[PDB]
């Protein structure tokens, strides 16, 4: 566009793009993990809290979780059998569809899947998921938790977020002088319905975390067997 | 009228102690051989200390296109000495012959840059031997397979001052 083009943002944050060199570094690191560790895994985790990911990383000192862009991990595993870093290694790359989540480990293959079956943590609604539970906002004054907990311990919502309640959340909030209030007990979501993204934003602003989370796994490479296996659990 | 390509040659008036001075050659585009020799002397004066009095035209001949009927893309080196100092330029042209391509290039330069023929220089011209060597989109759009475009505004001429038919734009 020679003219009348949209202006670019000029924000002056200290951070800068890592560039292709970071991708090459992750590629070399994945190759080192492939040539060092025997077993390999392709975890699927579309979203995870950063502290939860750190807690998963600290669960064992004997293993490493080289996260990266799915294309980078695929090229490290070989996009095709001719490009595979190791025999039959290309098959492990084919199974991945989601975020990964590669988990090289020297630990016994059974213990890893057992720990994954045991691990579980609370998580947000993660839209396109069925509603964990049905609830309705109190017809009286709104509170920071949304009334999920008894009002005597709850505190009124800060006024500063009220306009977002009218614009983003679509709730017909009325900002009464002293506190925000709604004339009627608006329902956040019915049980089992596919959540709208605005409904998930409302549940996040209210702090509800009824949904559970547990990383799934689809397959694990075995360098000793030189072949992928399709064991899976959720 | 139409531009005519020409080649020029010289040897700087051979003198004693320098038998057979080295020949030089430069393709030139001009309406006539006189202008071609003038541009050749003007180029030799810039690339060498020699002068028209110091040399002579060893030969002059027109260069007809080997395949004038054939369509050909033609990239062309260009530089114009205005308004600021001279700088390199490049343009693609789809023309049936190199001379018509040079004429369309001179017209596009005089239009989009107001450059005069005295300022324009043609450092090089070459055909695009193969597809996808083209870069700018305006030539690429004509390369599409089975391309077809209309001419909706066919404004027919009317020699008569009056027209009882109320002519249509058809098409």
């Amino acid at each position: 566009m020679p003219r009348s083009k949209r202006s670019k943002l000029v924000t002056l944050a200290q951070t800068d793009k890592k560039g292709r060199e970071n991708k090459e570094r992750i590629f070399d690191e994945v190759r080192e993990a492939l040539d060092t560790y025997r077993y390999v895994w392709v975890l699927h985790l579309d979203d995870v809290r950063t502290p939860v990911l750190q807690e998963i990383r600290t669960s064992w000192a004997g293993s490493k979780l080289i996260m990266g862009k799915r294309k980078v991990l695929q090229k490290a595993l070989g996009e095709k059998r001719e490009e595979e870093y190791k025999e039959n290694l290309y098959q492990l790359s084919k199974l991945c569809s989601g975020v990964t989540g590669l988990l090289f480990t020297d630990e016994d293959v059974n213990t890893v899947k057992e720990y994954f079956k045991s691990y579980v943590r609370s998580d947000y609604s993660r839209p396109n998921t069925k509603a964990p539970l049905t609830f309705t906002i109190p017809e009286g004054i709104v509170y920071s938790r949304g009334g999920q907990i008894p009002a005597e311990e709850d505190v009124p919502m800060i006024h500063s977020l009220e306009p977002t309640m009218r614009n983003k959340f679509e709730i017909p909030t009325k900002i009464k002088a002293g506190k925000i209030t709604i004339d009627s007990p608006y329902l956040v979501c019915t049980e089992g319905e596919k959540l709208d993204v605005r409904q998930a934003l409302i549940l996040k602003q209210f702090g509800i975390a009824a949904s559970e989370f547990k990383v799934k796994v689809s397959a694990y490479y075995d360098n000793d067997s030189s072949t992928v296996e399709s064991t899976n659990i959720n | 009228a139409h531009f005519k390509e020409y080649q020029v040659i010289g040897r700087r008036l051979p003198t004693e102690s320098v038998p057979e001075p080295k020949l030089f050659r430069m393709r030139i585009f001009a309406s006539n051989e006189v202008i071609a020799k003038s541009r050749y002397w003007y180029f030799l004066q810039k690339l060498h200390k020699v002068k028209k009095a110091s040399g002579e035209i060893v030969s002059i001949n027109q260069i007809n296109e080997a395949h004038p009927t054939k369509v050909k893309n033609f990239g062309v080196w260009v530089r114009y000495d205005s308004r600021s100092g001279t700088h390199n330029m490049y343009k693609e042209i789809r023309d049936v012959s190199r001379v018509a391509a040079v004429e369309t290039l001179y017209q596009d330069m005089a239009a989009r840059h107001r450059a005069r023929f005295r300022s324009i220089h043609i450092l090089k011209v070459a055909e695009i031997e193969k597809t996808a060597d083209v870069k700018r989109q305006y030539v690429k759009q004509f390369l599409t397979k089975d391309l077809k475009f209309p001419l909706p505004h066919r404004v027919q001429k009317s020699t008569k001052t009056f027209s009882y038919k109320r002519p249509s734009t058809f098409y």
Binding site: - | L147, F149, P150
Partner: protein, 191 residues
């Protein structure tokens, strides 16, 4: 660069029908029908398989491509209005004097009416546009829900409604009273 041609697809819902002979356009659907005068825009519609239409602009400039893109946008808007419709909403609020908005059938035009705005004795009137149907929101205090097949009519009606009540000679920061848009969702809701 005087592109050799440009075009944009126009998806046709199976229940929609949109005859086009002249540049004037017409559309029909379960919710009704609509029409528009596009003769000025100089564009050529082209049906392919009755499920799509490809407007085209040969040898056009960048401004002509922008005209073609807005033509496709107006066509998609007319299709969404004849299929889904539109259901505008506008909350109103007051500080000390309650608002008394009410519909009236003066002169047969179904004039909108407002009273006691900020205590003013003037009775402002905002005539309803053709097609759009005013209706107060059910079980929702101090609200009105405009709706109409065309975005243009309902949008101009909401604009005139918010403009007729504009405050004057008073600081806006203290006087929050005045009608304001609340939502611009489709009549379906949820389909």
């Amino acid at each position: 660069m005087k592109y050799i041609q440009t075009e944009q697809q126009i998806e046709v819902p199976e229940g929609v029908t949109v005859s086009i002979k002249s540049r004037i356009v017409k559309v029909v659907g379960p919710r009704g029908t609509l029409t528009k005068n596009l003769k000025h825009i100089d564009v050529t519609f082209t049906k392919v398989n009755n499920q799509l239409i490809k407007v085209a602009v040969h040898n056009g400039g960048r401004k002509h491509v922008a005209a073609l893109r807005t033509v496709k946008s107006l066509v998609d808007n007319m299709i969404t209005g004849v299929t889904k419709g539109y259901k505008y909403k506008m909350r109103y609020v007051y500080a000390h004097f309650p608002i008394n908005v009410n519909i009236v059938e003066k002169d047969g035009a179904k004039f909108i009416e407002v009273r006691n705005f900020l205590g003013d004795k003037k009775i402002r009137n905002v005539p309803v546009r053709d097609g759009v149907t005013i209706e107060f929101s059910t079980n929702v205090k101090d609200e009105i829900v405009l709706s109409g097949n065309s975005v243009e009519d309902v949008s101009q009606n909401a604009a005139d409604l918010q403009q007729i009540c504009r405050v004057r000679n008073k600081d806006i920061r203290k006087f929050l009273d005045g009608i304001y848009v609340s939502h611009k969702g489709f009549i379906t809701e949820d389909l």
